[PDB]
Amino acid sequence: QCVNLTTRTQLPPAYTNSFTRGVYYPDKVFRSSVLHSTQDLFLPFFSNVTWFHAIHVSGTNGTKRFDNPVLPFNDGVYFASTEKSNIIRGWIFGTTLDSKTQSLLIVNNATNVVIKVCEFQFCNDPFLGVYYHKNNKSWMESEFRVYSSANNCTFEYVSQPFLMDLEGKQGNFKNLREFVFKNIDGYFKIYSKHTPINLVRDLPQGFSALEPLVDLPIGINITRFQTLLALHRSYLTPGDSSSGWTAGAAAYYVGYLQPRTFLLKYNENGTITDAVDCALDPLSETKCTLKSFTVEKGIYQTSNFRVQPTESIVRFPNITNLCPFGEVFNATRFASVYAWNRKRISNCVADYSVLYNSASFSTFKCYGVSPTKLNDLCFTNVYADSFVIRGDEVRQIAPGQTGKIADYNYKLPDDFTGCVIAWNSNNLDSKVGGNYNYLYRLFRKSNLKPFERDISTEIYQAGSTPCNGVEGFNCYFPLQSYGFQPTNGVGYQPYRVVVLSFELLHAPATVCGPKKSTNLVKNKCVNFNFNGLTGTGVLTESNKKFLPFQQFGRDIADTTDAVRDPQTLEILDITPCSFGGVSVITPGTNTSNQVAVLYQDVNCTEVPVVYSTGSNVFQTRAGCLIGAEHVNNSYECDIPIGAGICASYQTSQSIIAYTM
Amino acid sequence: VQLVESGGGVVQPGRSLRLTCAASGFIFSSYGMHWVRQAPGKGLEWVAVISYDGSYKYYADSVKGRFTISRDNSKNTLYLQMNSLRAEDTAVYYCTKADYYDFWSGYQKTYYYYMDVWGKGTTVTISSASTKGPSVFPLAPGTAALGCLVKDYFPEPVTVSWNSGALTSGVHTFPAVLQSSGLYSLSSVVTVPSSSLGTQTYICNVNHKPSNTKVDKKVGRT
Amino acid sequence: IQLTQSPGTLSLSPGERATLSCRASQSVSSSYLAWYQQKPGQAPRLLIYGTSSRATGIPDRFSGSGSGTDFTLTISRLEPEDFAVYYCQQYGSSPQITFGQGTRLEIKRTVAAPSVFIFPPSDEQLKSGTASVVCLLNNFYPREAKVQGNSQESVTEQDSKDSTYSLSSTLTLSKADYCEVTHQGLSSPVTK
Ligand SMILES: CCC1=C(C)C(Cc2[nH]c(Cc3[nH]c(CC4=NC(=O)C(C)=C4CC)c(C)c3CCC(=O)O)c(CCC(=O)O)c2C)=NC1=O
Ligand SMILES: *[C@@H]1O[C@H](CO)[C@@H](O)[C@H](O)[C@H]1NC(C)=O
Ligand SMILES: *[C@@H]1O[C@H](CO)[C@@H](O)[C@H](O)[C@H]1NC(C)=O
Ligand SMILES: *[C@@H]1O[C@H](CO)[C@@H](O)[C@H](O)[C@H]1NC(C)=O
Ligand SMILES: *[C@@H]1O[C@H](CO)[C@@H](O)[C@H](O)[C@H]1NC(C)=O
Ligand SMILES: *[C@@H]1O[C@H](CO)[C@@H](O)[C@H](O)[C@H]1NC(C)=O
Ligand SMILES: *[C@@H]1O[C@H](CO)[C@@H](O)[C@H](O)[C@H]1NC(C)=O
Ligand SMILES: *[C@@H]1O[C@H](CO)[C@@H](O)[C@H](O)[C@H]1NC(C)=O
Ligand SMILES: *[C@@H]1O[C@H](CO)[C@@H](O)[C@H](O)[C@H]1NC(C)=O
């Protein structure tokens, strides 16, 4: 079945420009008339994409090309076909592309669309073939020479049958067929878009977002792919199986996905009608900064510049031990409210998710941290204070509140960061005949400081004569019993109340998570969140040699410069991957496309460390400019650059800088 | 490489003072700093710590929340504010820099921490007593000893010599010890042969710089 | 955290091995320790860190060992510049690091007999309105002694040319308020 084709000629590789093609819907969220910013694997605008063509040029030893080479897959592929006679028939994806590994085949064999994930012995020169029969003028599918064997097939889909037009056509290419292929978490994602065209070469400029086509659960590694094309045989192609063939005109183009940040416009029907590639050029940077497709004239420094980050790293001290929260909450006996029981929690990995998701808790109210944000915040001490009170008093356990319980039994600070759980305990903690095992302090001469336990037996003086410590008249014992009964009202029913205080210090992380750590890389512009401190930049091995039991150092501007990861205890240094705050000067997009770039606090000799570098630079004490041209004329300030420098779009027509 | 201390002197109990520490010979923005004190006739004691930038400042529990530490990197200067000053803090203060030796291990980073350079330090005296002049008194007498007793003076440092510095053999100057009244006093003695006492004169010279007093006292024989 | 030292006082002659012990009340890592020295009236200087390494510019005679909670500083030969006070310090189990107590490492020699002198208060001292009694003892080793309604003693630092100690006892008395020496070397009390 495998045949190595001959008679190909040599031709240098060709390239073209992708314009603004290749945008696809990155999710399935229901939208209408909104702009949305997202970092995902996209084809950069105006990329040099590779151009491949199946043709047979007229003349003696005319160029004869049938392009089906192996290509890398990397992080995903944008593919575009310009067709008239349907030469491109599909693809194969894999790593070895032999029976040693599994491979994916997506091929349209003129009767069906076939998708198969199997161990394939693919041919070195795989192809499909159509035969033209002169006598009845019929173009019929004749050859299928993709693989020589298929074993351990694990996925198979065959579409409903059809009969496709296989005729070799005359004229210009008439259909553009675009695909975006991704391999994410074992799922092969296919997005596609079909467009009528009329051209001989290149790609159309019109914008069209690709619509997600299919999501295949195949779970295979993909690093390489090959295009499957259909050739032609007829009485006009004498020769053997290797040489008796010709190529019907067709072209295809390959561009490569990479992590890019796009601003996408969703219209009233949710269709992506336009997009901005933030890192294409400063104008796109301004548009992404202002969250708008239209930007008015002015000077903006917050636009800055981004090479973007590559990957994210999460690190925490490696602790797997389970916390005893379940043991504490499921205990049989507790202390009283005046003797609130305190347990310290340290050296553990947390599981608050199940506690929050539990439906057996009457009141679960938190201050300082939201339950969703709690999983990603990292603590050094946990304090669990447990007691039991009647249901109506539960509302008194809250910051900045008064009442006998708050004043005399348990206090909370006005700057409390922590959360409170309380839930009904009528059956377990109440019984007939009264309960004298839970009491409360009702009478004392002052309030309590926050987090202060007291079990004093000082006899309260309620009259005008000292008791001297002996029970008498108007002489009250400070503690009184609730006397819970199971037949009373809901307000009198006992309730278990616990408070979790998340004590944060400047100390090594102790109990945090639950989230798995990730391998560490350096010398790359990445996102990171060390112990709950989040940043974007490049991590380098630099030494400041600070103190033991220190975690971060700060500059004058109060931004983190040094970090100490837990699993290594290494002194990493943070460097911003930008060139600093760079200012853009614009006269408005709807008026002109020329812009000026001011590198504040930057010399013109550092700029080279899209305008690549200085070509005609004016230097002021405010910085370097590349777009504005000096004139000896003086005019009223229109856009004040600063330091006596003002700019405007004036005479030719260009942005010029002047000094009144 | 060296460091200098300044700000020491005399303070009433209950006031505030600012001690300053300066450094020369090394980069001041790459190391932390420690304040460690020594009580008279006692061991060393931790006081305070400041990091390189001013984001980690702990304190000893014995003086927790009392002293305040600060630094200015631009002027290469270190300041210590003493608030709620007590009478126990009469001592000597040293400012030193933290350093550590680095060692690599299996997926680890081991630090041998220590302190390497120490300044001469500055003394601090805490007493409600006022300044007093020196009361110099004679001590009438093989070999025999005679001396001069200096009583009711303040501060601690005082200078005693004999024979205008022309006598340095057998001289014993005892360290001062505070008495019940709170005034430092001591005695200085010299031993000489008995025959020379009746043939050679002897003088005791007392220098007290804070009061700027020079006293020449003769010792007679009873 | 706190540490304890052993022995409380040490007196050996030059040219023999010296051993000092530092003990902990809580387990610490043996790579988190240091030893410093201090001679009177001088800034303390680094000697050892990590119980196994040496500091820059210090001779080999200083060495360290130990682990757990028991630590040991060792000196092979003793020269006159090793005669000072020594401290052991932990600086990695933080915060609130603490120092040692303090060991005096002095000279021991042959027993010597103190010279004992008595001094009554001067007449002009009584004219001023004060009174004092000076019981002076000079040139005696060892330094422990009991001298005899209040006492105020003073022990000077040893002279590094004869290795002796000079002691003075001051008995303070008012205008109107109207000596016992015992020593290890002495085998008979001497009274003034
Ligand atoms: C690479 C192989 C390939 C082949 C062969 C074709 C051929 C094809 N495909 C289709 C239609 C088609 N084909 C497909 C998917 C598809 N057909 C294939 O053979 C392959 C491969 C795919 C995608 C994975 C869709 C989603 C549609 C409808 C698109 C629309 O109408 O908006 C036609 C008839 C409609 C026309 O002429 O535009 C024809 C002739 N499309 C391809 O993608
Ligand atoms: C095609 O060529 C490759 C490499 O030259 C060779 O390994 C293979 O056997 C050939 N197959 C056929 C059918 O000629
Ligand atoms: C694409 O690559 C070619 C080959 O080096 C290069 O000449 C061209 O400038 C590149 N174009 C872009 C837009 O990067
Ligand atoms: C195309 O492939 C399907 C599935 O393997 C097969 O059933 C069908 O016969 C093929 N078409 C031709 C023309 O061989
Ligand atoms: C044309 O002729 C060939 C050869 O006889 C035959 O295989 C094919 O089916 C014919 N086409 C039609 C449409 O009848
Ligand atoms: C599938 O691959 C495994 C590889 O270990 C092989 O043992 C097995 O025989 C294969 N299945 C079939 C049906 O041959
Ligand atoms: C949007 O939907 C409306 C009907 O809901 C339709 O008439 C219109 O053509 C669609 N597209 C645009 C751009 O309005
Ligand atoms: C408490 O007991 C219940 C009932 O057996 C059990 O399902 C739960 O895991 C335990 N822990 C917590 C935190 O609820
Ligand atoms: C994780 O903890 C284990 C338990 O001792 C340790 O062996 C391992 O080195 C740790 N991983 C680190 C420190 O990266």
Author numbering:
A (entry chain A): 14 to 622, 635 to 676, 689 to 697
B (entry chain H): 2 to 142, 150 to 230
C (entry chain L): 2 to 149, 159 to 188, 196 to 209
Paper text:
To structurally characterize the epitope of a neutralizing antibody targeting the C terminus of S1, we imaged single particles of the SARS-CoV-2 spike ectodomain in the presence of excess P008_60 Fab by cryo-EM. By contrast, classification of spike monomers, also present in recombinant preparations of the viral glycoprotein construct (Rosa et al., 2021), yielded 2D class averages revealing features consistent with a bound Fab molecule. Further image classification allowed us to reconstruct a 3D volume of the spike monomer with one molecule of Fab at 4.3 Å resolution. Almost the entire S1 polypeptide, spanning residues 14–697 comprising the NTD, RBD, SD1, and SD2, could be docked into the cryo-EM map. The structure revealed that the Fab is bound to the SD1, making extensive contacts with the L3 loop of the subdomain. While the resolution of the reconstruction was not sufficient to describe atomic details of the antibody-epitope interaction, the recognition of SD1 is almost exclusively mediated by the heavy chain of the mAb. The tyrosine-rich complementarity determining region (CDR) loops 1, 2, and 3 of P008_60 pinch the SD1 L3 loop. The extended CDR3 makes extensive interactions with SD1 loop L5, reaching out to the glycan attached to Asn331, while CDR1 and CDR2 make contacts with SD1 L4. Although L3 loop is partially surface exposed on the structure of the spike trimer, the epitope is not available for the interaction with the antibody, and the modeling predicts extensive steric clashes between P008_60 and the NTD of the neighboring S1 protomer, within closed (all RBDs down) or open (all RBDs up) trimer conformations. Indeed, our cryo-EM structure revealed that the N-linked glycan at position N331 is located in the immediate vicinity of the P008_60 epitope.
The severe acute respiratory syndrome coronavirus 2 (SARS-CoV-2)-encoded spike glycoprotein is the key target for neutralizing antibodies generated following natural infection or vaccination. Spike proteins assemble into homotrimers on the viral membrane, with each spike monomer comprising two functional subunits, S1 and S2. The S1 subunit contains the N-terminal domain (NTD), the receptor binding domain (RBD), and the subdomains 1 and 2 (SD1 and SD2) (Wrapp et al., 2020). Here, we identify a class of neutralizing antibodies that recognize the SD1 domain of the S1 subunit of SARS-CoV-2 and SARS-CoV-1 that have arisen following both SARS-CoV-2 infection and COVID-19 vaccination.
